[PDB]
Amino acid sequence: KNVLYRR
Amino acid sequence: SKTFIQVX
Numbered sequence: 001k002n003v004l005y006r007r
Numbered sequence: 008s009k010t011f012i013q014v015x
Binding site: 002003004005006007 | 008009010011012013014015
């Protein structure tokens, strides 16, 4: 939810 | 609190 990933 | 985890 608040954990967003960046490739 | 948003965390932006970098994957590769």
